[PDB]
Design a protein around this ligand. Structure first.
Ligand SMILES: [Cl-]
Ligand SMILES: [Cl-]
Ligand SMILES: [Cl-]
Ligand code: NA
Ligand SMILES: [Rh+3]
Ligand SMILES: [Rh+3]
Ligand SMILES: [Rh+3]
Ligand SMILES: [Rh+3]
Ligand SMILES: [Rh+3]
Ligand SMILES: [Rh+3]
Length: 129
């Protein structure tokens, strides 16, 4: 499913991301924009053989099981395919664990390089939230 910007903002808000670990909703929407272009079905292979899945491009190296990432963990206790669903519940719940692990949103390289320090509020402008 390819979310609209405000549609995704609304779903992220309902699921508790707004100000989660101190990160305003615009941070999460900006991250999703540059990670996946709001596409829940997005996948990308990493150089190390792990794969990133879903709207927030969650990595099989640590967070989910895809059966093809040797030596990896499954800290969110989910198949990576759960992260591709039209329902963002699994991605949000796993994202909450990632952002709590010490590095905050710096875990998402595209957030660090493209969202951090910018006017992220722009990403939720106009939405009925
Ligand atoms: Cl914001
Ligand atoms: Cl594996
Ligand atoms: Cl932080
Ligand atoms: Na894994
Ligand atoms: Rh808000
Ligand atoms: Rh890499
Ligand atoms: Rh399985
Ligand atoms: Rh649901
Ligand atoms: Rh839902
Ligand atoms: Rh502004």
């Amino acid at each position: 499913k390819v979310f609209g910007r405000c549609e995704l903002a609304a779903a992220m808000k309902r699921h508790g991301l707004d100000n989660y670990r101190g990160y305003s909703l615009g941070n999460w929407v900006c991250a999703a924009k540059f990670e996946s272009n709001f596409n829940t079905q997005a996948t990308n292979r990493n150089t190390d053989g792990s794969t990133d899945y879903g709207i927030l491009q969650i990595n099989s190296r640590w967070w989910c099981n895809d059966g093809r990432t040797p030596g990896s963990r499954n800290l969110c206790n989910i198949p990576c395919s759960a992260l591709l669903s039209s329902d963002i519940t699994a991605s949000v719940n796993c994202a909450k664990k990632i952002v709590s692990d010490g590095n905050g949103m710096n875990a998402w390289v595209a957030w660090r390089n493209r969202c951090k320090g910018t006017d992220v509020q722009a990403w939720i402008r106009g939405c009925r939230l």
